[PDB]
Design a binder for this molecule. Structure first.
Ligand SMILES: O=c1c(CCCO)ccc2n1C[C@@H]1CNC[C@H]2C1
Ligand SMILES: O=c1c(CCCO)ccc2n1C[C@@H]1CNC[C@H]2C1
Ligand SMILES: O=c1c(CCCO)ccc2n1C[C@@H]1CNC[C@H]2C1
Ligand SMILES: O=c1c(CCCO)ccc2n1C[C@@H]1CNC[C@H]2C1
Ligand SMILES: O=c1c(CCCO)ccc2n1C[C@@H]1CNC[C@H]2C1
Ligand SMILES: *[C@@H]1O[C@H](CO)[C@@H](O)[C@H](O)[C@H]1NC(C)=O
Ligand SMILES: *[C@@H]1O[C@H](CO)[C@@H](O)[C@H](O)[C@H]1NC(C)=O
Ligand SMILES: *[C@@H]1O[C@H](CO)[C@@H](O)[C@H](O)[C@H]1NC(C)=O
Ligand SMILES: *[C@@H]1O[C@H](CO)[C@@H](O)[C@H](O)[C@H]1NC(C)=O
Ligand SMILES: *[C@@H]1O[C@H](CO)[C@@H](O)[C@H](O)[C@H]1NC(C)=O
Ligand SMILES: [Cl-]
Ligand SMILES: [Cl-]
Ligand SMILES: [Cl-]
Ligand SMILES: [Cl-]
Ligand SMILES: [Cl-]
Ligand SMILES: [K+]
Ligand SMILES: [K+]
Ligand SMILES: [K+]
Ligand SMILES: [K+]
Ligand SMILES: [K+]
Lengths: 206, 205, 212, 205, 205
């Protein structure tokens, strides 16, 4: 339909691509996790596999429009190929992340974007003692691979992972799941890098 | 042949692609499953593997033509890359879906589209008790990932999964298989999201 | 080289791609199999894995040329991406087919095409009794996914599968294999769909006689 | 640098791509193998897994230049996607080959090309007896899938496989490894087809 | 923002891509490793799996700009597809490397490029004795697949692998990890090829 075709043409065809954030124009990405399943533990390799979806939110002045000019359209669905998306990376993955959901984001007229990729992740986690009453704690950091806190900052709306869609017949019960903003430094670079640390305490369903 | 080449040029090389449904111009997708096989059960991970094909049907005013202007062509086969397709997603998959069929749809002159992809799906399912008389029940929801009920509604033509092509020598016998429209809500969003819940009761043959 | 570059530029750069067959302009695809190996049997899942090459042949008026206009060229090899190819699909695959050969077809001046992909297929097959003297029978149907018999018909040149290149040290001995045209109907659609049904009779290789 | 940019633009932006060899303009591909490892044996499926790199060499008049016109450049590295490469295929693979090296070739001013892809290959091989003093012999043929001997000929520079980079702590030791040109006919086609037969005799270390 | 969009347009849209190094304009790539985990050992195939990130650094005159003409911009992030990147390859891999990080480099106004890909590598390594106090030593060379020492030289900033991010609960403890420049010759070619030899001594925790 005609107004949406005109809006996407104006935002995407009639302009150069956003080159990502800079020290002079930084952005904040909001992250939140919905943990669906601890699928698998490998005690020979200390790898654990999670299925989750990761809510990402950011805002660009370059994606703003006036709904009055575009038939009162206030938001639209678009291919994530059409827009810049942040390079949010699991810092202790052992396999490439597997994508479980369509690469489609929602853009709102204030320039705000929400993108909610479902992923299967293999990460470094020692499951020794998962068969006990006290279980095991594992953690994985999610943040930009290449932008410091001077270009990409992160936040969470809450410290509590959403467990409302956790698989009730998983082999693993969740005892706690937190998502916490964290600062790290790396050998290569003096600047602080920001991540959200996902910390999960679990045990066999003891 | 010449009439079909003209039709495809007129439909695909003139307009921009359909930008998907909206609140002002919503779409109903019809979904149905043909279950071919329960291929694998993993009791160490509670993952079960299905092979099926999923019939999808929708209709766009933008895909209409007058057959009289195109040598009485009433439908054509086309690459699914040429057309918008709905983002129908399994909500509890544990692996990316494996595509088993050519990505080709049929478009009809009234603007109706049918697309029937074959898939192998791993999903969240506890098979504890599959070796018993009563067997086990597992369920997986299929719906738009990104469009609410205000842009994509769903329906089935029947609540009975088609079992007329179920593999006769499968390790697993199907006791029942249903496909039912449901409403769900998610933390992110106040709007209702529509799914078709595929519910399968099965046991070792 | 100059004459072939001219022919491919003329055939491929001047007109839209062939939009595939229609009820008005149907085509017949010839299929035949050369079975190279039964690689694997999965008795936990009733999956069996075949390696074969599949000879496909069809003919398009739009691929015709006069060899006298193109330095007496009578045929050429080309990327299978450059031409229409039939959507021949295994109906009981459990995994995406794996391609083992280059995607290159031969086009002949009469508009005939031959394309011989090598594939590894996992399909639905119960191997219970494969370790017996009699072995097991499995079958898989190959046909268009999307075109009825009104757009794509199939045939074989012979109902006998080519077993003369079967791997002599396979885990599995091939007893016989047939490739037979068949008509099917599906729930979605009233039109007949055509397949070639590949039937394989095999058993575990053990000096063991074949008697019936 | 300026002279190489000019050479690449002159070779690759001006003409249509080379349409491959013909009966009127045939080519010879030289092949040789460097065997790095027998990585795995599967006695349940009679599949063996090799890691090797394959030296391929051929010559096209269409890739010639005069070094004097391009700053005395006599050769250059280029993406294998920029040039025609031969469709050399293992005849008894059981899996798609896995590429282990960058897709980059070296073109020389006489029009000669050298391309040395590293591959992991699963092929048809019964390893029964590998744990014995005499070991086991397996073979795999490499050749064009689609070109006869009238369009592509093959040769070797030596019948000895290069074992100078064989992994010294492999599970398997090599007793012999040879590479031998052969000719045969196929049911589909009237002309002779060329292959190079890789024959490896090995045992447990 | 505007100054960065202008700089990228000037660097990438106005000239051909850099055609890689030559004997007349060679380059030096700095390499270093950050070892995150020895993930897996396969005693049946003598394959070991590493997770690491590899810091790569080089400098091109063609990537230089004056920050004064671009709003004081001194560096920028860019897709690795936008620029030339060196063909650094593990010489004893047994499977294609799996990429674990975004393909995004940083270009600085002096033309220097830093690119830090994270990878999972399967390579040739006999783990026999890893359960002992003395453990085992494995080695893998990293270098250009196609460029000799006349086009690509390598250096390290240190011969000590960075173990500051090694997984504290790995099955394997690192006893030592070194990264050392070395010269190799190959059968095909008389010229020296340069690699960085990654030597890791490890044992069961
Ligand atoms: O890849 C980059 C870049 C971009 C290239 C160098 O400027 C910056 C910083 C870092 N990396 C990779 C590692 C993970 N993230 C933090 C740190 C180490
Ligand atoms: O990805 C989206 C979008 C688009 C991005 C946000 O507006 C909407 C709604 C939802 N998701 C992802 C999850 C699954 N489906 C329902 C719900 C939660
Ligand atoms: O995908 C299609 C199409 C095209 C889409 C609907 O017109 C037709 C017919 C069928 N399919 C898929 C299944 C397998 N092949 C036969 C039958 C059922
Ligand atoms: O695919 C072709 C072609 C091209 C198509 C027919 O002209 C020629 C010859 C052959 N094949 C495939 C098989 C393997 N290689 C030799 C022989 C049989
Ligand atoms: O692929 C090439 C090239 C380019 C093609 C021949 O000029 C040069 C040299 C080598 N190779 C591959 C092997 C590994 N690296 C060193 C040596 C052997
Ligand atoms: C947009 O909003 C104004 C004010 O309510 C209304 O007059 C106009 O017709 C609307 N157009 C739409 C929804 O197409
Ligand atoms: C199309 O339909 C009309 C109406 O019956 C028919 O008479 C006409 O010949 C047809 N035209 C074609 C096939 O081009
Ligand atoms: C085509 O046909 C005849 C040989 O019968 C020959 O005289 C003519 O030169 C041929 N053309 C080419 C380019 O070979
Ligand atoms: C090419 O060759 C001669 C030396 O024989 C020399 O004069 C000339 O400068 C060389 N280099 C270039 C870049 O032309
Ligand atoms: C660039 O730097 C100079 C000197 O510090 C300053 O005066 C100028 O306004 C700066 N421009 C920017 C940040 O755009
Ligand atoms: Cl954007
Ligand atoms: Cl469309
Ligand atoms: Cl065609
Ligand atoms: Cl070429
Ligand atoms: Cl560059
Ligand atoms: K993007
Ligand atoms: K589509
Ligand atoms: K094709
Ligand atoms: K090529
Ligand atoms: K690159």
């Amino acid at each position: 339909q005609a107004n949406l075709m005109r809006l996407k043409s104006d935002l995407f065809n009639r302009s150069p691509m956003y080159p990502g954030p800079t020290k002079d124009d930084p952005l904040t990405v909001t992250l939140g996790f919905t943990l669906q399943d601890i699928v698998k533990v490998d005690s020979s390799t200390n790898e654990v596999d999670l299925v989750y979806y990761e809510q990402q939110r950011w805002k660009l002045n370059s994606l703003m429009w006036d709904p009055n000019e575009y038939g009162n359209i206030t938001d639209f669905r678009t291919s994530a190929a059409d827009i810049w998306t942040p390079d949010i990376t699991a810092y202790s993955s052992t396999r490439p992340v597997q994508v479980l959901s369509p690469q489609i984001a929602v853009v709102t007229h204030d320039g705000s974007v929400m993108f909610i990729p479902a992923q299967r992740l293999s990460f470094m986690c020692d499951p020794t003692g998962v068969d006990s009453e006290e279980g095991v704690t594992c953690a994985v950091k999610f943040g930009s691979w290449v932008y410091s806190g001077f270009e990409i900052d992160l936040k969470t709306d809450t410290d509590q992972v959403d467990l409302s869609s956790y698989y009730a017949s998983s082999k693993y019960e969740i005892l706690s799941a937190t998502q916490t903003r964290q600062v790290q430094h790396y050998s290569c670079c003096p600047e602080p890098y920001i991540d959200v640390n996902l910390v999960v305490k679990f045990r066999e369903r003891a």
